[PDB]
């Protein structure tokens, strides 16, 4: 793709010196110019704009219940998945609701269903999936999980990565499994689903030298996209609907076209340790790569970078002669 793209911003969060625990989840907000990050001990914070200035922060679960698993976004605020609960907060911070249940034991992933953003389904390494009304903050119904799920992405179907290198294609209305796709031999490391494509990284600890590809429109697997440095993470481009960006474990990135795979653009992200997280902004004009040393690297064109379609400023707090203060008495 473009050529003037570079690392625009690098931050280290949590800050060095407490401690070396990287974000466990990250996502660009589609509605606000915010990057959301989740951490161990149930901590969330957001970062604003190209400089990634810390904005708001809140907790979603007791410290003992581990890491943040995933974000989803709604007009009303940010939905955050924990291990034994689901949280929803205003972008400006305050809690809207917090849902716990006996059947929420080991949640890993969630997706919107058939009602646009009105309804979500949450799932994990557990035998039950729970459907939630986002507006009311209520569990609507509970549905058996045919397999334990680690990752969910939604396009035509709810695409659910299993623990065995397969993806279940779930109907968002009936929740039946339409088709199962064996994307990699034994495990899936990463998955994205956008605009009738599924793309995956995975292996047979040992990653495959390609990104596997599934055509959701025609319901057939496609020829894998070769990636000799071994493919660790992948995201589909939100504006170039047949383009994906792939990275190795060490930050070598290839921009590739599913329809014309041999044509590719290569960039190198100078990360000090291996990749933990990799996300693209809804605008397609930014991406983040996070490493195991807690570095968060923001990439984009130094002049055009922005996260959302409408790059709006956000709700913030607000002399020669300025003498003086009276204490309460």
């Amino acid at each position: 793709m473009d050529a003037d793209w570079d690392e625009v911003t690098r931050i280290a969060y949590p800050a060095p010196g407490t401690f070396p625990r990287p974000a466990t989840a990250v996502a660009f907000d589609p509605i606000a110019e915010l990057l959301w990050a989740g951490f161990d001990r149930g901590r969330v914070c957001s970062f604003y704009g190209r400089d990634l200035t810390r904005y708001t922060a809140f907790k979603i679960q007791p410290a003992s219940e581990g890491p943040v698993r995933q974000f989803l976004f709604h007009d009303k605020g940010v939905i955050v998945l924990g291990t034994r609960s689901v949280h929803m907060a205003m972008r400006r911070g305050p809690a809207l609701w917090n849902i716990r249940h006996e059947n929420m034991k080991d949640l890993r992933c969630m997706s919107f269903t058939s009602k646009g953003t009105q309804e979500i389904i949450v799932a994990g390494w557990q035998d039950t999936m729970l459907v939630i009304d986002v507006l009311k903050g209520d569990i609507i119904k509970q549905i058996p999980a045919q397999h334990h799920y680690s990752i969910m992405k939604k396009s035509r179907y709810i695409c659910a990565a299993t623990k065995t290198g397969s993806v279940d294609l779930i109907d968002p209305l009936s929740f039946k499994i339409v088709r199962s796709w064996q994307a990699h031999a034994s495990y899936i490391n990463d998955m994205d689903a956008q605009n009738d494509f599924i793309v995956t990284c995975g292996g047979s600890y040992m990653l495959d030298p390609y990104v596997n590809v599934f055509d959701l429109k025609n319901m057939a697997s496609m020829k894998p996209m070769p990636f000799p440095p071994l493919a660790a993470h992948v995201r589909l481009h939100p504006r170039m609907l047949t383009t994906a960006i792939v990275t190795s474990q060490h930050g070598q990135m290839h921009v590739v076209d599913i329809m014309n795979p041999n044509s590719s653009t290569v960039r190198y992200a100078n990360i000090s340790s291996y990749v933990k997280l990799f996300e693209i902004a809804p605008s397609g004009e930014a991406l983040v790569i996070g490493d195991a040393d807690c570095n968060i690297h923001l990439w984009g064109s130094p002049t055009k970078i922005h996260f959302t379609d409408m790059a709006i400023p956000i709700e913030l707090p607000e002399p020669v002669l300025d003498w003086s203060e009276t204490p309460l008495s």
Binding site: R43, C45, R54, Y55, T56, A57, F58, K59, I60, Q61, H87, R92, G93, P94, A95, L96, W97, N98, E315, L316, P317, E318, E325, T326, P327, L328, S329
Partner: protein, 105 residues
Amino acid sequence: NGRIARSLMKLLTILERGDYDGVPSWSETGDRYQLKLFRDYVFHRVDADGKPNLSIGHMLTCMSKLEAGVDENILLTSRDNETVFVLSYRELRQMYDRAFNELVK
């Protein structure tokens, strides 16, 4: 008029009731947590080195802006800086009123 005095008494009536123990809305993940943080913002200020800032001007100004429900945003933070909210006096006034009404009904 005495609106601030009445608003101060409403804060004392609303906040830190024994009946709130074990109630999720008043925890750090609950939808009334900001009402505790606003109290901290106004009345539990300290400078660097931890000396209490007892400036009465700050207190009456914040209570006045709260009563008027102005659109100005302020930064609410927990003591451990792991909770950080941006809220308007407008929203805070609505939120205190909601909490108060929970006591009336």
